[PDB]
């Protein structure tokens, strides 16, 4: 009968190269229950075929997903995770920051 | 080093569609090997390391049954757990399981479990003897004593110590390259200002596997844990992890501050300073 | 696969009787035996988890998973002991058991007072047709088949007014015509 | 416990075959299995929460089980074929059993699929009353009954006395023999025996029956030979209690 | 490997 809200970090695999090929991650853990909406984003515009892992959860129950894609940073685009579920009443938005 | 073999298990109920969502992970230390997923198409147990993809049909059909007949049992406690509670058929309720096998650097079995979760919250766990169970609750209790009349903790004694300990022995060997494999972290450092009095020092640790690294940041050669933050270690996503770790300092004095990297994989630990 | 011998043993009552199958898949974990009547289901008898030995009353089970080799033992053997033993046998991944193909066993009766006697019957309706019974004869006593196919034999079997134990030993032969009438039947073994 | 249908069926090739079975109340696992009159058991398929669970042993033609609820499952068999003929047995339990090795059986379907139902014979049965000479030789008496002629082998033979049905003295054959071993389906013999003592044999009052129940043709199948269908019956032969 | 044949019912 018990909510907790995910955490969200927003992060590239590799470290970003302006015109280099990366992955842009979203870590969404801490959350329950499981239903979670995630979005990856480029300039506020969804990302379409986002890739995702196989739920699991940590030592305390709760709830943890990698949220992905191939993209390629620039100097001027902007990237976010934007994330859903009952504990938010909107969807949050974390932006990238590359340092970081 | 030590090892572990653990299957994760969550089943959500669903009213007004058809069916539990049953979602199954196995992993061997920090590399999942196996899925399956109640929505997807294929119904079977799906490989998910290299080293699993050569068990044969026999073992797939086995693995991919179990799972299933897992989910079987998940689909009578939702229901059960409603009728213990009380609750109303109109919401969607969570069930959770874990169980599992440490190893120690020898190969030799350390422990085993089994814990369950009804709504995120401890219901029953096999305690550490696996003769016995802890129960959270009066309706865990009428559940812990369908157990111990049905001998569950001998069956479970019998595969954590046996079959478990056994098969996970295997795996380590199959996949050594992978599973065996350590891959040291490449660390480097960053600084920006925060204030005028203010600079804000992250240390980092990239590519490493597996997991469990100790970050730390010395001010003289002494532990600095006031104004110290560690993110939570995160998968890069291509089987390795990242971590970093931050401290708060007055500025101009960046070098004063040693960030350590500890690692597996690390012969010595690291040290690390701002040279700007 | 599991291999079982089919038999038939035929043995003595009081005899010690032992049983057994050998199988080939190591992860068969559950071993098990079950005792089946004729023309009844199967009757689980004993069950054995991995677990080496294991007795009740006259019945004892055992398993060694290293020559992947089981076997049930009865003691003191008695008549009503006779039916086919089937040992069955499962991993941890299924309910799915595999059975070996059974053993049949027979537990021959003691005749205390043994008493080889050939009767005849009266047709019950108006039929000077009829047949001849061996009667309350002996347990060393194999009635066997035919000479040509028009006598017809049938084999012993074991009648007891049972509480008040008086048991007895039966065939029964027949043919259409006088020609073949109370003539030879042989016994040989 | 489980209950199974049909007991018997015999039928001729090329028909659809249903068989039922409803488990012991409460038991949420179900199996199907088959033994053909040579060996053990195979599972066919089992059941948990009316889910198939493992199939691994359903033949891969003609053989589809199903549950639509918790009290309730088919096998269906379309076509049947004669190598169909077995005794299929039914079985249900609950996961506190199932850990013990133990499930709970039916008492069986047992299934002829004959290619020519032309074949079908029901017995003739016959009984015969205690010798003149073994009533003073041991103060005991036999009858016999015997049933001849029958195929296919679906029989089951009871002795009755006074109208209540006779359980002690009574030995009948373990097997039913082929009158004809030279043909592989060929008729069928079978014998049964009822001793009592010479005083209960010799007193008026007493009726002995040899009551046979015969499995063959129900009310659906086609018949159009001379003689009377050879449809399931129970045939009986009688004998009186005297001092002659 | 897992555990098998099935968990016990709560």
Redesign the interface.
């Known amino acids: 009968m018990i909510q907790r809200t995910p955490k969200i970090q927003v992060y590239s695999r590799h470290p970003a190269e302006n015109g280099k090929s990366n992955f842009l991650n979203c870590y969404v853990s801490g959350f329950h229950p499981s239903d979670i909406e995630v979005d990856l984003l480029k300039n506020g515009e969804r990302i379409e075929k986002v890739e995702h892992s196989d739920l699991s959860f940590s030592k305390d129950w709760s709830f943890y997903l990698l949220y992905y894609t191939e993209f390629t940073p620039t100097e001027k685009d902007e990237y976010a995770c934007r994330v859903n579920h009952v504990t938010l009443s909107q969807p949050k938005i974390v932006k990238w920051d590359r340092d970081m | 080093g030590s090892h572990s073999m653990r299957?994760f298990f969550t089943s959500v109920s669903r009213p007004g569609r058809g069916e539990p969502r049953f979602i199954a992970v196995?992993y061997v230390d920090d590399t999942q090997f196996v899925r399956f997923d109640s929505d997807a198409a294929s119904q079977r147990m799906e490989p998910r390391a290299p080293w699993i993809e050569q068990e044969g049909p026999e073992?797939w059909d086995?693995?991919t049954?179990?799972?299933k007949?897992?989910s079987?049992?998940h689909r009578?406690?939702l229901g059960?757990?409603r009728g213990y509670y009380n609750q109303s058929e109109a919401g969607s309720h969570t069930?959770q399981?874990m169980?599992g096998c440490d190893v120690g650097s020898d190969w030799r079995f350390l422990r085993g479990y089994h814990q369950?979760a009804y709504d995120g919250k401890d219901?029953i766990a096999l305690k550490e003897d696996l003769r016995s169970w802890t129960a959270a609750d009066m309706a865990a209790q009428t559940?812990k004593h369908?157990?111990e009349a049905?001998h569950?903790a001998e069956?479970?004694r019998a595969?954590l110590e046996g079959?478990?300990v056994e098969?996970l022995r295997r795996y380590l060997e199959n996949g050594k390259e992978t599973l065996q494999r350590t891959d040291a972290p490449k660390t480097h450092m960053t600084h920006h200002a925060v204030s005028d009095h203010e600079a804000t020092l992250r240390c980092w640790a990239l590519s490493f596997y597996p997991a469990e690294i100790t970050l730390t940041w010395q001010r003289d050669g002494e532990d600095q844990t006031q104004d110290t933050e560690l993110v939570e270690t995160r998968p890069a996503g291509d089987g390795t992890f990242q971590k970093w770790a931050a401290v708060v300092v007055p500025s101009g004095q960046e070098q004063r501050y040693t960030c350590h990297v500890q690692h597996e994989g690390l012969p010595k630990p690291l040290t690390l300073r701002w040279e700007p | 696969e599991v291999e079982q011998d089919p038999g038939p043993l035929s043995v003595p009552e009081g005899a010690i009787v032992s049983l057994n199958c050998t199988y080939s898949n190591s992860a068969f974990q559950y071993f098990m035996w079950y005792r089946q009547y004729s023309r009844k289901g199967p009757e689980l008898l004993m069950y054995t988890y991995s677990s080496g030995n294991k007795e009740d009353g006259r019945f004892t089970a055992q398993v060694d998973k290293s020559s992947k080799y089981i076997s049930l033992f009865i003691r003191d053997s008695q008549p009503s002991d006779s039916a086919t033993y089937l040992c069955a046998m499962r991993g941890?991944?299924?309910?799915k058991l595999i059975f070996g193909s059974g053993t049949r066993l027979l537990v021959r009766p003691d005749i205390q007072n043994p008493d080889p006697a050939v009767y005849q019957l009266r047709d019950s309706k108006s039929s000077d047709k009829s047949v001849c019974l061996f009667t309350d004869f002996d347990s060393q006593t194999n009635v066997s088949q035919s000479k040509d196919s028009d006598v017809y034999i049938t084999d012993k079997c074991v009648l007891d007014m049972r509480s008040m134990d008086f048991k007895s030993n039966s065939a029964v032969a027949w043919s259409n015509k006088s020609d073949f009438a109370c003539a030879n039947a042989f016994n040989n073994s | 416990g489980v209950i199974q249908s049909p007991r018997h069926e015999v039928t001729e090739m090329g028909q659809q075959v249903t068989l039922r079975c409803k488990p012991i109340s409460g038991h949420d696992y179900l199996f199907w299995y088959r033994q053909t009159m040579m060996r053990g058991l195979e599972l066919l398929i089992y059941f948990?929460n009316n889910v198939p669970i493992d199939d691994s042993g359903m033949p891969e033609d003609r053989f589809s089980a199903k549950m639509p609820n918790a009290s309730f499952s088919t096998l269906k068999i379309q076509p049947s074929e004669p190598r169909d003929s077995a005794v299929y047995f039914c079985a249900s339990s609950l996961?506190?059993k199932?850990?013990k090795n133990i499930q709970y059986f039916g008492a069986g379907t047992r299934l002829s699929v004959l290619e020519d139902l032309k074949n079908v014979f029901p017995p003739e049965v016959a009984v015969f009353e205690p010798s003149e000479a073994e009533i003073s030789h041991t103060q005991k008496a036999t009858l016999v009954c015997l049933a001849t002629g029958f195929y296919p082998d679906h029989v089951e033979l009871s002795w009755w006395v006074n109208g209540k049905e006779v359980h002690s003295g009574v030995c009948t054959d373990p097997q039913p023999l082929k009158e004809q071993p030279a043909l592989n389906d060929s008729r069928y013999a079978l014998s049964s025996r009822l001793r009592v003592s010479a005083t209960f044999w010799q007193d008026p009052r007493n009726h002995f029956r040899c009551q046979v129940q015969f499995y063959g043709l129900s009310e659906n199948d086609e018949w159009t030979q001379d003689r009377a269908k050879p449809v399931t019956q129970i045939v009986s032969a009688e004998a009186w209690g005297r001092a002659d | 490997?897992?555990?098998?044949?099935?968990?016990?019912?709560?």
């Open positions: 299957y196995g073992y086995g693995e049954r179990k799972v007949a897992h079987q049992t009578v406690d059960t757990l069930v399981r169980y369950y219901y559940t369908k157990w049905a569950v069956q479970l595969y079959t478990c098969w | 941890d991944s299924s309910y | 948990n996961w506190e199932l850990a | 490997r897992q555990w098998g044949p099935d968990p016990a019912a709560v």
